[PDB]
């Protein structure tokens, strides 16, 4: 996260760290959506251009964390994966269209002050809140600048950007399964996700029922926090029929 701040304790209790077993290293962010299901970006698990194709046994999820590198005894909980599900039309060949994956845990995680699921949006909440200018919140342990790493979880609030501005900022083909967020060069304020924040959540607090909803997944960007560029996020509601099919069948 570029130009963010340290998270408060318990500020993002749905935050999940995707952790490689050997070598032990951070792979990605992710989010807790129930006691047994974790949401992330497909490219965190499968990206053939970089020879990335993880299996369940390669990976752990660490839930309840604040510190990036510490083992947070009596606070964090570490879970093994039962099964990975990648969207069948995830487009890793071109533009990361439908950049979404689910991970089912081997055993349910115990909720606590530090561990709690985020809501997924209904159609009405998505329609009301996914508007240009409305701000969401992105969290992660990724790079603090494009070209080190944070001591603790980072947080930045960013406005959703008009779709023509998103399209005109890049040569990559945008789709309806994406939205972009960030400040414009004139707006003064800054901030973005960066490498290592992949798969983490873009959340919004509904003013109707005061619950946090996950509207997006950190997907891609060209650099980090560049003027005239914007971060791109998987449009969670657009893919919710696939989410519900996986969870209902598995």
């Amino acid at each position: 996260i570029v130009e963010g701040s340290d998270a408060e304790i318990g500020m993002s209790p749905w935050q999940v760290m995707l952790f490689r077993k050997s070598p032990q290293e951070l792979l990605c962010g992710a989010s807790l959506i129930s006691d047994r299901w974790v949401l992330t970006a497909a490219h965190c698990l499968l990206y053939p251009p970089w020879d990335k194709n993880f299996t369940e046994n390669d990976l752990l999820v660490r839930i309840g964390k604040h510190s990036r590198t510490r083992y947070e005894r009596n606070i964090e909980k570490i879970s093994m994966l039962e099964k990975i599900y990648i969207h069948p039309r995830y487009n890793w060949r071109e533009n990361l269209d439908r950049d979404i994956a689910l991970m089912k845990l081997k055993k349910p995680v115990a909720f606590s002050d530090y561990i709690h699921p985020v809501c997924l949006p209904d159609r009405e909440t998505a329609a009301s809140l996914l508007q240009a200018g409305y701000k969401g919140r992105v969290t992660g342990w990724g790079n603090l600048k494009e070209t080190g790493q944070p001591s603790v979880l980072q947080v930045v609030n960013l406005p959703i950007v008009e779709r023509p501005v998103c399209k005109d900022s890049t040569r990559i083909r945008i789709t309806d399964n994406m939205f972009c967020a960030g400040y414009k060069p004139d707006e003064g304020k800054r901030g973005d996700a960066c490498e290592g924040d992949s798969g983490g959540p873009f959340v919004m607090k509904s003013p109707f029922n005061n619950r946090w909803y996950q509207m997006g997944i950190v997907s891609w960007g060209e650099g980090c926090d560049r003027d005239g560029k914007y971060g791109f996020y998987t449009h969670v509601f657009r893919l919710k029929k696939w989410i519900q099919k996986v969870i209902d069948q598995f």
């Binding site: 952790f19 032990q24 752990l60 570490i78 790493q149």
Partner: peptide
């Protein structure tokens, strides 16, 4: 760079 996690998870 990371603190070793308990062996039971590995």
């Amino acid at each position: 760079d990371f603190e070793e996690i308990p062996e039971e998870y590995l």
